[PDB]
Amino acid sequence: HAVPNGTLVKTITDDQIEVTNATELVQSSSTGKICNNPHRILDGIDCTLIDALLGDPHCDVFQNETWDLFVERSKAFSNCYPYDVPDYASLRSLVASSGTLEFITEGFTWTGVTQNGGSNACKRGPGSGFFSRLNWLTKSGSTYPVLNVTMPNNDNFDKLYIWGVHHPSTNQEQTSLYVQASGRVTVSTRRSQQTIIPNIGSRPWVRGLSSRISIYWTIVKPGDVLVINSNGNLIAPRGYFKMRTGKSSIMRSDAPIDTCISECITPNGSIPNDKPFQNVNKITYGACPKYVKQNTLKLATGMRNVP
Amino acid sequence: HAVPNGTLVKTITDDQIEVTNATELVQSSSTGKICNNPHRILDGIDCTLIDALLGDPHCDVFQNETWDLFVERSKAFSNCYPYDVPDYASLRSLVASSGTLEFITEGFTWTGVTQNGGSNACKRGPGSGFFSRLNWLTKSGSTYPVLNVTMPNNDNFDKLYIWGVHHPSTNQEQTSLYVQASGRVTVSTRRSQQTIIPNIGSRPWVRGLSSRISIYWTIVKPGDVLVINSNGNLIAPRGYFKMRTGKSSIMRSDAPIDTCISECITPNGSIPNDKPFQNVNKITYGACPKYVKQNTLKLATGMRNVP
Amino acid sequence: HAVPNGTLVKTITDDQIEVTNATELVQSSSTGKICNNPHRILDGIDCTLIDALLGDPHCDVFQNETWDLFVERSKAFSNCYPYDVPDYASLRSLVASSGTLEFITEGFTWTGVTQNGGSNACKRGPGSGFFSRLNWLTKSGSTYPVLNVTMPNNDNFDKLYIWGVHHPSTNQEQTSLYVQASGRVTVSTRRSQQTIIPNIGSRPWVRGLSSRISIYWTIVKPGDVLVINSNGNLIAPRGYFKMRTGKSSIMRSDAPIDTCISECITPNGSIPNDKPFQNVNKITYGACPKYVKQNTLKLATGMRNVP
Amino acid sequence: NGKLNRVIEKTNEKFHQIEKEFSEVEGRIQDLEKYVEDTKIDLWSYNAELLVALENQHTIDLTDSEMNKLFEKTRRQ
Amino acid sequence: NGKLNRVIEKTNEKFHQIEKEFSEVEGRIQDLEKYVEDTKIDLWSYNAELLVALENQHTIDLTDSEMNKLFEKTRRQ
Amino acid sequence: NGKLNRVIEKTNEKFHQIEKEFSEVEGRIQDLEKYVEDTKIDLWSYNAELLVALENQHTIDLTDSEMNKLFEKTRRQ
Amino acid sequence: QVQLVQSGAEVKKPGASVTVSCQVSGYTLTSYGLSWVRQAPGQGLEWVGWINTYDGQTKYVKKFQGRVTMTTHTGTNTAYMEMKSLRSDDTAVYYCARVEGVRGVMGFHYYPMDVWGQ
Ligand SMILES: *[C@@H]1O[C@H](CO)[C@@H](O[C@@H]2O[C@H](CO)[C@@H](O[C@@H]3O[C@H](CO[C@H]4O[C@H](CO[C@H]5O[C@H](CO)[C@@H](O)[C@H](O)[C@@H]5O[C@H]5O[C@H](CO)[C@@H](O)[C@H](O)[C@@H]5O)[C@@H](O)[C@H](O[C@H]5O[C@H](CO)[C@@H](O)[C@H](O)[C@@H]5O)[C@@H]4O)[C@@H](O)[C@H](O[C@H]4O[C@H](CO)[C@@H](O)[C@H](O)[C@@H]4O)[C@@H]3O)[C@H](O)[C@H]2NC(C)=O)[C@H](O)[C@H]1NC(C)=O
Ligand SMILES: *[C@@H]1O[C@H](CO)[C@@H](O[C@@H]2O[C@H](CO)[C@@H](O[C@@H]3O[C@H](CO[C@H]4O[C@H](CO)[C@@H](O)[C@H](O)[C@@H]4O)[C@@H](O)[C@H](O[C@H]4O[C@H](CO)[C@@H](O)[C@H](O)[C@@H]4O)[C@@H]3O)[C@H](O)[C@H]2NC(C)=O)[C@H](O)[C@H]1NC(C)=O
Ligand SMILES: *[C@@H]1O[C@H](CO)[C@@H](O[C@@H]2O[C@H](CO)[C@@H](O[C@@H]3O[C@H](CO[C@H]4O[C@H](CO)[C@@H](O)[C@H](O)[C@@H]4O)[C@@H](O)[C@H](O[C@H]4O[C@H](CO)[C@@H](O)[C@H](O)[C@@H]4O)[C@@H]3O)[C@H](O)[C@H]2NC(C)=O)[C@H](O)[C@H]1NC(C)=O
Ligand SMILES: *[C@@H]1O[C@H](CO)[C@@H](O[C@@H]2O[C@H](CO)[C@@H](O[C@@H]3O[C@H](CO[C@H]4O[C@H](CO)[C@@H](O)[C@H](O)[C@@H]4O)[C@@H](O)[C@H](O[C@H]4O[C@H](CO)[C@@H](O)[C@H](O)[C@@H]4O)[C@@H]3O)[C@H](O)[C@H]2NC(C)=O)[C@H](O)[C@H]1NC(C)=O
Ligand SMILES: *[C@@H]1O[C@H](CO)[C@@H](O[C@@H]2O[C@H](CO)[C@@H](O)[C@H](O)[C@H]2NC(C)=O)[C@H](O)[C@H]1NC(C)=O
Ligand SMILES: *[C@@H]1O[C@H](CO)[C@@H](O[C@@H]2O[C@H](CO)[C@@H](O)[C@H](O)[C@H]2NC(C)=O)[C@H](O)[C@H]1NC(C)=O
Ligand SMILES: *[C@@H]1O[C@H](CO)[C@@H](O[C@@H]2O[C@H](CO)[C@@H](O)[C@H](O)[C@H]2NC(C)=O)[C@H](O)[C@H]1NC(C)=O
Ligand SMILES: *[C@@H]1O[C@H](CO)[C@@H](O)[C@H](O)[C@H]1NC(C)=O
Ligand SMILES: *[C@@H]1O[C@H](CO)[C@@H](O)[C@H](O)[C@H]1NC(C)=O
Ligand SMILES: *[C@@H]1O[C@H](CO)[C@@H](O)[C@H](O)[C@H]1NC(C)=O
Ligand SMILES: *[C@@H]1O[C@H](CO)[C@@H](O)[C@H](O)[C@H]1NC(C)=O
Ligand SMILES: *[C@@H]1O[C@H](CO)[C@@H](O)[C@H](O)[C@H]1NC(C)=O
Ligand SMILES: *[C@@H]1O[C@H](CO)[C@@H](O)[C@H](O)[C@H]1NC(C)=O
């Protein structure tokens, strides 16, 4: 049996051969929106993952959030103390894979220092503030004792501690905030240690400041111990982020979230996974078709078309 | 010709079709033991590779050992001075690939320092000891001269020097062991250099100590020169490990070594390599079948079964 | 139809079967020369990419060069101040991918220091010289002010700044060149910073010197700002390298460049890309056949040979 | 039907992967990630092409044989 | 016989490879190693599936043709 | 003709890749690069082998069928 | 300055084996391949062999296959050519010469012997 018009497919021994009926195997178009089911999507409005992690004021809505996919918009910006994350990609990757911002406040005993330091560049409410998940320790009175504190991990989940080192701009500011001429920070565990020597130097003017914060992280495995030993320039943690394992991930996309059902999410939106191959994007999340370079692949579903 | 019972295989155009005789292509079971031939297996009892490398006392049996596959048991532990290896994975990988712990003692001329320093946390025999392949240089009398020693590589094989930096816990211990307030170590060659600034700070209590050793390595190519320049906190090498090239590797497995013949070793034991694909483990050594996700793949070895 | 002699090919169900005519699919031989068209080849005689980048005297011919493939000969050597590039591979890779050595001299205002420092190990002309793309700042008179200079990136292309830190051999030389006992260098941008603490120590004698230069790079994106803050041991940049994007790359090969046409260049020379697979080398540039391990693959182009 | 169920059992379910878009220029690691992704994409594109070609070939061969057989039998009857 | 000798020439002999099990969490490099291993495993699983399917198809086609030919010839004799 | 145009569309055009030859010994990253390159080479070698085998099989089957058909028709005439 | 300094004169007996060494100076031995050329007294030059430093792959003339071995001690920037089963016809001057190509190509196919030992 034959049909009037036919579709041209390609075989081992033929560039083009006409057949009665042929289907497409490459999903090359996207709906343009991200379905919010079944995957727990978290739309990050104006907030990058690290900003919500640290506790940027305009990100206070993201506290204790959880997600199956964190969509990070291109309009996101930082509006707090100018910070800098050495190995930013690794921290972002592991935080995103953990899949929760659940922050447990721990009781740290800082003796002889002024806690809750703040700045005018990070304005919380009407007054000066700081990152909600960090604690800026400054000299109390006229001394800055060598802080030496510890926290044991007695639970059976990893703990993620986010701390930082404050690089001042001028030596006067260094000695005004921390009486030592050049302090250092050392966060260590049983298996590894990490020491930072803060430097003093002017930096490009960002949000009214020349000083910076360097953000580091330390993962305390179960049964391990954290020891923080510093004599200046320490941005102490306030607690720990509960690390996890799961199917969580992060994605950079400006697609709007929509109320629908779909399993495969690309930055171009949710796409159906009926077809085995897709050409939309090479970044995928969920049960997605395999990305291919071709924009069309015709599978013959009928007999050779001889009309 | 036909048979009473048949095996169901899968083709291009059939999910299940019965055939007279069908063979299996996936090796999904392991004998559970590691055959000790023909590959030169080295069972590491209670010793990690790095521990045997450094010369941990309870690893003194591993001196000058060679292997084609170092099996590293999960029960291994360290019972010496608490050390720490930045880039631990790289050092372990290259030592394992070298395939020999052959250590050649070189004559180093340390003038004005007390050699063979030891500690009670690393008890060799009845008394205090240290790693057999390292030399803890401390102040002699009341001074610590700036050590500046050299060794040329006149042989045509790479030399591997393992040295370390001692981080003391307290400033008093720093000045008691090394008169300089804050020394440093610098090991350099013609092509590269490496400098470490030891820090002083309390660390999590491990085996009765708060101080640490940071273990670094330096590879001196043929015709090159090593220069060690330090003014404190130096754990000098005693000689060099003869680097090599070969088919050597390392594996983490608790399988017991057994007397038999087999070419393919996985952490689950030795497996036969007659079948082309295997499903046991994705970590393999030797002429091993390619790992696949499927647990069964039936190859038809007969005609279609029409009984 | 049949032929007297035939070629043995391999199928799904036959190890060897004779056929009338069979073609080869693996290109296993190379012409031995590198065709200089259409790809803009740059033969680097006695000059490595980094040496031409820095401005080694015997590489002054490579200034403002551009290439589609930089061929780096095995005879290349350095004949200037003994330098060292931490993360050498990354710098070489990104410079090679940029595809141009176009250097724009910028006006840097170094106040209170002696510019154009030179050395006898890097002899330009008859007298002492230095790298043409670096500026060795030494103390002027008897002081060395804390240099704090800036350059904004107002153009819409990336800028690549190459700077360096001078490690002296002896403390006397340190205080003779830079009055500070131990200076430091800090090159920072809005998004990242990089600080180096120069060390003082003797190093293996190379080209008459024990001191070294550590070469670092900083990429200033459009709209960003560079701030250089140092108080000693600074090898300042003179300008910026215009970064680009393109099909540029680098190759290590001693093959001689030849006047001909070819698209696929391997270290063994230019090879034709008519065949789909090649066995010459796994390093390729251009539209090259896919590398395979087999040295022969016969494709049947005729009927079964029954003579 | 779909006919690819036997060859590709299902759409495998991947959640966390490497970065495939980079803003700045890092060097070795970024080049490695780009190379890995490009290698994977090329291999999967080739696999898709070959699979489609094989399925088309076998489908047309089968349908052609059936058409020819039915024509012969109907002509003989 | 085994019939796979022609397609897979032998079991290639690999000695030193990357780590495929990790204790702690590192970040970029660990993710890259995991991704590389997963990519390799998926590609080899697909290759194995397709190879088995092709061999089964050709074996059954060949045996079916032989059975049919012998039946026709014996019936004609 | 070449007959591989359909399966391999063209020679894909690669410009900048990872290092595939190393002088010294680095460790993790060098091992990762070596492993990635070896994996790619093995997969492409297998793909080439299988593609050649399939093309040879189909070519010989087709030519054999044509030879047999022409022999039968000429004998009948 | 690029210099090649060879061993001293050797006096041997037939059937023995000799080892001629070539010490390079002014450059790194692995940057250049090294050819060995003999000259019987008043009989013109005769190419003996070629050692590819940096990968050790050799190439000898069929006349010398098996009875000539070239190795490179990279530590001392030295290269050794040993001849086993010496004959009377092997009395000659031996020169080590520097050739350019080591990576990608066999050097002597395309490059000359720019620097010679004594
Ligand atoms: C296209 O160009 C390429 C580039 O030149 C050609 O590739 C070369 O091809 C030749 C011939 O096919 C190869 O030589 C053959 O090698 C085998 C065994 O080789 C094994 O070792 C090789 C060298 O290892 C040394 O060098 C490397 C790199 O420098 C170093 O990392 C090693 O550690 C080792 O170093 C030692 O030697 C140095 C120099 O003396 C010392 O300084 C040092 O201290 C050490 O002592 C190695 O390259 C080779 O293959 C590896 O690398 C390739 C990639 O090139 C990869 O594919 C492999 O998987 C390996 O990873 C092996 O490991 C040797 O046995 C052969 O000898 C034959 O001939 C002699 C006499 O002629 C007989 O006595 C033998 O019995 C045997 O028959 C032969 O020498 C060469 O190795 C290869 N690569 C290089 C870099 O040169 C390619 O051939 C060209 N193709 C065409 C078509 O033109
Ligand atoms: C080391 O060297 C660096 C680089 O040269 C110096 O850094 C500069 O420091 C000065 C002051 O210390 C900074 O000047 C300030 O710039 C701010 C940003 O201005 C930019 O953006 C505005 C729009 O927001 C534009 O209009 C403007 O043209 C710039 O493009 C200004 O907002 C600041 O203004 C404040 O102070 C002035 C002072 O008169 C008042 O008039 C204003 O009303 C306001 O209160 C000020 O102008 C400069 O930006 C820094 N540059 C960089 C790149 O960081 C270091 O100071 C120097 N340190 C030492 C110790 O030498
Ligand atoms: C900076 O801050 C850190 C953290 O707070 C301090 O580190 C602690 O230092 C103290 C002493 O300096 C350590 O105390 C010692 O702990 C050892 C380990 O005990 C653990 O394990 C045993 C079983 O093995 C358990 O029973 C016990 O509960 C612990 O869980 C003990 O073995 C030591 O005992 C010895 O000393 C005591 C002193 O009275 C004697 O009674 C004993 O007989 C024995 O001789 C001792 O108790 C403590 O472990 C450290 N903690 C960590 C996390 O390292 C630094 O000291 C501090 N430094 C400064 C300068 O402030
Ligand atoms: C810390 O420790 C290191 C290592 O021990 C010392 O480094 C050595 O320093 C000395 C001098 O300070 C260096 O000696 C010089 O070596 C040069 C290189 O010589 C090599 O190469 C030549 C051929 O080019 C060979 O002939 C020679 O045997 C060597 O193999 C020489 O060229 C120098 O000669 C100059 O000075 C001498 C001095 O008498 C004159 O006679 C000469 O005519 C010429 O002017 C000189 O011999 C030595 O090379 C360094 N070694 C290394 C490995 O770097 C540090 O000095 C030391 N520092 C401190 C503070 O203790
Ligand atoms: C070719 O086959 C496709 C696949 O079934 C047919 O598309 C379906 O057609 C039916 C008509 O009864 C619809 O109900 C389905 O929704 C269609 N599915 C899709 C995915 O399109 C198509 O009609 C066939 N064409 C011809 C000419 O036979
Ligand atoms: C199906 O084929 C397999 C493969 O040969 C047969 O298994 C072999 O059978 C012989 C019997 O003579 C034994 O000696 C071998 O040891 C068997 N080998 C293996 C790997 O099992 C099997 O007998 C065949 N089955 C049928 C029903 O014909
Ligand atoms: C087998 O086929 C090849 C491919 O065409 C033939 O090689 C060509 O032969 C023609 C002769 O007319 C030459 O002009 C071409 O230059 C050849 N091309 C190549 C790439 O070799 C070959 O002659 C055929 N052999 C037989 C016996 O038929
Ligand atoms: C169907 O056939 C008509 C002519 O009969 C032709 O114009 C058209 O392009 C064919 N395809 C479709 C989708 O209409
Ligand atoms: C977040 O959760 C923790 C425990 O799950 C709780 O202690 C804390 O108060 C919560 N914070 C907010 C803002 O809800
Ligand atoms: C063989 O056939 C019997 C029935 O004849 C059936 O019960 C059995 O499952 C078949 N297979 C085996 C392995 O016995
Ligand atoms: C190890 O071997 C080296 C040389 O191969 C030798 O000098 C040394 O004494 C040996 N050590 C032991 C414990 O056998
Ligand atoms: C061609 O056939 C001759 C004998 O007829 C045989 O000797 C030869 O090897 C065959 N092949 C070639 C390339 O000559
Ligand atoms: C290189 O090019 C820049 C601008 O393209 C120019 O200013 C500079 O003088 C050039 N240098 C040389 C040596 O030609």
Numbering used by the authors:
A (entry chain A), B (entry chain C), C (entry chain E): 18 to 324
D (entry chain B), E (entry chain D), F (entry chain F): 49 to 125
G (entry chain L): 1 to 118
Article, verbatim:
HA is a transmembrane viral surface protein which is responsible for interacting with host cell receptors and mediating virus entry. Three HA1/HA2 heterodimers assemble to form a trimer spike protruding from the virus envelope, with the HA2 and the short N- and C-terminal fragments of HA1 forming membrane-proximal stem and the large middle fragment of HA1 forming the membrane-distal head. Triggered by the decrease in pH in late endosomes during virus entry, HA undergoes conformational changes that underlie its transition from a prefusion state to a postfusion state. Through initial biochemistry and cryo-EM data analyses, we found that F005-126, a neutralizing antibody targeting the HA head of H3N2 viruses, fulfills all our requirements.
We obtained three major conformations of the HA-Fab complex at pH 5.2 (HA-Fab-pH 5.2 conformations A, B and C) through 3D classifications and refinements. The densities around the stem region of the HA-Fab-pH 5.2 conformation C are highly disordered, and atomic models were built only for the head and the central helix. The central helices of the HA-Fab-pH 5.2 conformation C adopt a straight and extended conformation rather than the bent form observed in other conformations. Further analysis showed that conformational changes occur mainly in the Helix Ds, as indicated by the calculated r.m.s.d values (0.4 Å between the 90 aligned Cα atom pairs of the Helix Cs vs 4.0 Å between the 60 aligned Cα atom pairs of the Helix Ds). The membrane-proximal ends of the central helices have a shift of 6.7 Å compared to those in the pH 7.8 and other pH 5.2 conformations, which corresponds to an anticlockwise rotation of 4.3 degrees around the three-fold axis when viewed from the bottom of the central helices and with the membrane-distal end of the three-fold axis as the pivot point. However, the coiled-coil parameters of the superhelical radius and superhelical frequency calculated for the Helix Ds of the pH 7.8 conformation are 9.2 Å and -3.0° per residue, respectively, whereas those for the Helix Ds of the HA-Fab-pH 5.2 conformation C are 10.1 Å and -0.8° per residue, respectively. Both the increase in the superhelical radius and the decrease in the superhelical frequency of the Helix Ds indicate the unwinding of the coiled coil. The conformational changes enlarged the distances between the membrane-proximal ends of the central helices and created an inner cavity with a volume of approximately 1400 Å3. Furthermore, the extended Helix C would have steric clashes with the fusion peptides in the conformation at pH 7.8, indicating that the fusion peptides could not return to their neutral pH position and conformation. The fitting of β Hairpins 1, 2 and the C-terminus of the HA2 stem and the HA1-N into the cryo-EM map as rigid bodies showed a rotation of 9.5 degrees around the three-fold axis and a shift of approximately 15 Å compared to those in other conformations.
